[model samples]
Target: LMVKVLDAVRGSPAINVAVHVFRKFVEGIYKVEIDTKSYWKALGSSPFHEHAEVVFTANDSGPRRYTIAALLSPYSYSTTAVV
Candidate 1:
């Protein structure tokens, strides 16, 4: 199976981020996790942005999957992984 990822951001600035997907031995479902690592120089020198949305897709076809978004802060902060 294969997986895909999609991302969307709002506000005047866009944040730099990364995402990972997790699969379970269920049926018709998967989990996606999004992490923010840095901020784009285009988004100013803030090194972070708000109103960001990250989407993740999994190859597995089982279990109920959810999404987790990480706030990319200059101090380094992460969100809990949801599955």
Candidate 2:
């Protein structure tokens, strides 16, 4: 699994951010967590949301690689999945 994280403020890649991609042992829902508190501390701003959580489930017929796209902001956030 991989992550494509970005900040909507600059519309730039959030390379400074940290993400936790749960490589779960199951046939379903995986939880993704991102740390914004650490990211914003040195980025010259304060984040309203300390962490971002995006949990999604898998419904498929075959095994596949996964990609997670998280668009972030101080007060808002989103998640996208690619399989």
Candidate 3:
């Protein structure tokens, strides 16, 4: 059986994303794909809106190494509380 690994990081201008699924009982890289959808559920309040898209891909795979990246929309609202 093969193992899978995933990781993501938020960066300037957008968020990063990555996903990996195991297969062939060995290491392999998959082509990255981007997906987008019209997000009008927020009634034009969503930060990303319909243009909010997401990307994910994998790379640099070895016996014990892997890397990936993604660019998530910069929409959406969030609140933070500091004590």
Q: Which candidate comes out best when scored by TM-score?
A: 3
RMSD, every candidate, angstroms: 24.9, 22.5, 22.4
Candidate 2, pairs of clashing residues: none
1-83 per-residue lDDT for model 2 (tens digits): 55675535655543445455765454534455753233223645665468767664654476656454535433236654565
lDDT of 1: 0.51
lDDT tens readout by residue for model 3, 16-38? 44566545656645465644444
TM-score of 3: 0.18
The segments of candidate 3 whose C-alpha lies over 4 angstroms from its true place after superposition are 1-13, 25-75
Query: Which lDDT tens digits does candidate 1 get at residues 1-83?
Result: 77565455565554444555676844533444554345333755753266656664545456766553544333334455456
Global CA lDDT computed for model 2: 0.50
The order of the candidates by TM-score, greatest first, is 3, 1, 2
Q: How many residue pairs collide in each prediction? A: 8, 0, 4
